[PDB]
Amino acid sequence: GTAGKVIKCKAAVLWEQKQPFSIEEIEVAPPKTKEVRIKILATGICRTDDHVIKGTMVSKFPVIVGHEATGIVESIGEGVTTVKPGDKVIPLFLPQCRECNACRNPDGNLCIRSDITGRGVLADGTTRFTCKGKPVHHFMNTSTFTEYTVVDESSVAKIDDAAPPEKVCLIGCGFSTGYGAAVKTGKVKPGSTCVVFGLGGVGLSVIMGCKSAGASRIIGIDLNKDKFEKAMAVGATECISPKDSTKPISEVLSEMTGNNVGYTFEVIGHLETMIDALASCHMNYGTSVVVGVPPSAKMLTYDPMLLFTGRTWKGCVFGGLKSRDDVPKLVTEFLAKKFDLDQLITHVLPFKKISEGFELLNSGQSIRTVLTF
């Protein structure tokens, strides 16, 4: 078997920033203590991965990004008790050590293992993939744009065998974040009026969340009018584009709802919309959840009076879900015909066609692209 020896395989390595991917043969060192080596079956293309290339999100290069996926367990390391080889799992970019401060805190989730610093290694303070002698860095405790990867046990959730790898892979980042941001983070209330800024893969996920919450009205806001039709299929009661009017978006939504915007979700990644998403929620009882990651090295400049009058402004990391616990239950839900992930997946391509997936994304012609292996 391979269990115990260096594996050689294909990987969409990224040598520099703003540089294109190049599929290359790498050396997946076998798992160490409490580590697991996974064989990736399917991996989706999320906006975060695209951020790395553009420079909007820093990382150590060379890197093997990707984090939204699902695979089978090839071999487990020393001590691995939660999963055995053959098990269907989903790597988790947000760990759940079950011992750290937040992991202990019922209203927390950002484990101490989490890598939002751009460390590019595992707990061991080291890398598993090699290439041309050169070591290559991990991405957010995961790295799924590769045939095989190694993740700490703290980053592995075991899901149902019946789960179709192409659909459930969305649950590793896109759907769990969006859905949770509405249901968990913002705790949308039945009857409220939600408005989503960004009709992307994660945005539509929130729309679904609001739909499960019972939101009476859901307004989809997006620059690309071609997204509306799908947003509405998912649950949007109406959508609009910021350019439809010359008067501020906050005044638009204000007059549209009758100054009743109860919730607002920023799922884009721009400072400006982080502010008009805030402003667009009711000055007193409106909540504005920031789901999109702000551009690296940028500082937001705002009017405190927006917050002072009573606004609740909260951040969101993986829908505030506790990965090792929620990922499993969420997958069961999908199988329970609760929701339809099919409506988010617009393109399924083979890994070799990874550049087509990305471009289709930047072209605004694909919600979620699934790269199957």
Ligand X SMILES: NC(=O)c1ccc[n+]([C@@H]2O[C@H](COP(=O)([O-])OP(=O)(O)OC[C@H]3O[C@@H](n4cnc5c(N)ncnc54)[C@H](O)[C@@H]3O)[C@@H](O)[C@H]2O)c1
> Does 251 participate in binding Zn ion (rule CB under 5 A)?
no
Sequence-separated (6 or more) residues with CB below 8 Å from residue 130: 26, 27, 29, 136
Kindly tell me the burial class for residue 255, based on how many C-beta atoms sit within 10 Å of its own C-beta (0-12, 13-18, 19 or more): exposed
CB 280 within 8 A of CB 249: yes
Chain positions 141 to 180 lying near ligand X, rule: CB under 6 A, are 173, 177
Interaction partner, residue 51 (ligand X, Zn ion, its own copies, none; CB < 5-8 Å by kind): ligand X
- Distance separating alpha carbons of residues 279 and 316, to the nearest angstrom: 18
**Nearer residue to ligand X within complex by CB, 164 or 364:** 364
Burial of 285 (0-12, 13-18, 19+ CB in 10 A): middle
- Which CB atom, from 85 or from 118, has the smaller least distance to Zn ion? 118
Nearer Cβ to ligand X (51/211): 51
d(C-alpha 59, C-alpha 40), whole Å: 22
Query: Binding site annotation covers 199?
Result: yes
Query: Residue 15 Cβ, how far from its own copies at the closest point, in Å?
Result: 27
Residue 246: phi and psi, rounded to 5, are -95, -25
| Using rule CB under 6 A, residue 95 touches ligand X | no
Of 31, 62, 165, 203, which one interacts with ligand X (CB under 6 A)?
A: 203
Tell me the residue nearest to ligand X as measured from the CB: 200
Considering only the stretches 78-86, 95-103, 149-157, 220-228, report the one whose residues sit in contact with ligand X under the rule CB under 6 A: 220-228
Q: How far apart are CA 283 and CA 64, in angstroms?
A: 43
Tell me how long the chain is: 373
Question: How far apart, in Å, are the Cα atoms of 81 and each of 33, 100, 116, 152, 365?
Answer: 11, 19, 26, 12, 42
Nearer to ligand X, 62 or 203 (CB): 203
Judged by beta carbon distances under 5 to 8 A according to partner kind, the member of Zn ion, its own copies, ligand X, none in contact with residue 267 is ligand X
Asked if 232 is part of the footprint of ligand X (rule: CB under 6 A), the reply reads no
For residue 105, state whether it binds ligand X (rule: CB under 6 A): no
Q: Known binder of ligand: residue 310?
A: no
Which of 31, 286, 292, 357 contacts ligand X by CB under 6 A?
Answer: 292
Cβ neighbours around 118 below 10 Å, total: 15
The one among 32, 51, 113, 128 contacting ligand X by CB under 6 A: 51
197 Rama class: left (phi>0) / alpha (psi -120 to 50) / beta = beta
Tell me the two tokens of residue 124. Answer: 């061991």
Q: Cβ(41)–Cβ(165) under 8 Å?
A: yes
200 among the known binding-site residues?
A: yes
Place of tokens 């179709």: 164
Nearest approach in angstroms of CB 126 to ligand X is 26
Q: By CB under 6 A, which span of 109-117, 145-153, 187-195, 219-227 interacts with ligand X?
A: 219-227
Does the footprint of ligand X cover residue 22 (CB under 6 A)? no
- Tell me which residues touch its own copies (CB under 8 A): 101-102, 105, 107-110, 116, 258-260, 271, 274, 282-285, 290, 293-294, 298-305, 307-317, 320
- CA 66 to chain centroid, in Å, comes to 10
What residue numbers does the annotated binding site for Zn(2+) cover?
46, 67, 97, 100, 103, 111, 173
What residue numbers does the annotated binding site for NAD(+) cover?
47-51, 198-203, 222, 227, 268-270, 291-293, 316-318, 368
